[PDB]
A paper describes a structure:
ORP5 and ORP8 possess the structural features of a lipid transporter: an ER anchor (TMD), a membrane targeting pleckstrin homology (PH) domain and a lipid-binding module (ORD, for OSBP-related domain). Indeed, ORP5 and ORP8, and their yeast counterparts Osh6p and Osh7p, have recently been reported to mediate the counter transport of PtdIns(4)P/phosphatidylserine (PtdSer) between the ER and plasma membrane (PM): ORP5/8 was shown to transfer PtdSer from the ER to PM, coupled with backward transport of PtdIns(4)P from PM to the ER, resulting in its hydrolysis by the phosphatase Sac114–16. Critical to the transport function of ORP5 and ORP8 is their recruitment to the ER–PM MCSs.
To understand the structural principles of ER–PM tethering by ORP5/8, the structure of the ORP8 PH domain was determined by X-ray crystallography. A distinctive feature that stands out, however, is the presence of an unusually long 25 amino acid stretch forming an extended β6–β7 loop (His209–Ser236). Comparative analysis of electrostatic surface of ORP8 PH domain with Osh3p PH domain reveals a distinct positively charged cavity, representing a putative PtdInsP-binding region. The analogous surface on the Osh3p PH domain has a neutral charge suggesting that ORP5 and ORP8 PH domains may possess a distinct PtdInsP-binding mechanism. Close inspection of the distinct positively charged cavity of ORP8 PH domain shows the amino acids forming the basic patch are lined on the β1–β2 and β5–β6 loops (non-canonical mode). Structure-based sequence alignments of related PH domain containing LTPs ORP5, ORP8, OSBP, Cert, and Osh3p establish that the putative PtdInsP residues (red inverted triangles) in ORP5 and ORP8 PH domain are not conserved in OSBP, Cert, and Osh3p. Notably the side chains (green triangles) mediating canonical PtdIns(4)P interaction with OSBP, Cert, and Osh3p are missing in ORP5 and ORP8. To confirm the importance of the non-canonical basic surface for PtdInsP binding, we designed point mutations R136Q, R179Q, and R158Q, R201Q in the ORP5 and ORP8 PH domains, respectively. Both the point mutations in ORP5 and ORP8 PH domains completely abolished the binding to PtdInsPs, confirming that ORP5 and ORP8 PH domain follows a non-canonical PtdInsP-binding regime. While most PH domains (including Osh3, OSBP) utilize the canonical PtdInsP-binding regime for PM targeting, the PH domain of ORP5/8 possesses an atypical PtdInsP-binding site that does not permit PtdIns(4)P binding.
Author numbering: 6 to 64, 67 to 127
Amino acid sequence: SSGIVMADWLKIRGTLKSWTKLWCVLKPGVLLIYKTQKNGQWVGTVLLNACEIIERPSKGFCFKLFHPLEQSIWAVKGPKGEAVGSITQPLPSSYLIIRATSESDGRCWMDALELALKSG
C-alpha cells in the first residue's frame, strides 16, 4: 500500500565531494532522502517531475538528477511537514550526483527513476 517503488542506500556527492551514504526511497514523482533506514531523519525530497536524468561515467556507477532549466529540484516541505532538512554536507540546489554499489543496481535505479519522473 506504501507506493514505495524502491528503497536502498545510495551515495550522494555533496558539493564537498563527501559522498555521504543516505537512505533513499522512491515514490512516484519523488525521491525521498533520509539519514537512516527506518524512521530516519529526513534530509530532502527531490521533485522528480522537474527533473531529467543522465548517466555519468566512470568510477562504480554514477548518475545525475538535474533540473534542465537550472532551477531548484527540492521540495519545500518534508514528507511529515518538516520545515527544514537534517543538516548534511551541503548539496546543490538544481542537481544531484548519485552513486550506487553495483552497475546492475545503478541501472535499476535509473530506469525506475525514469518512469517515476512523469508520474505522481
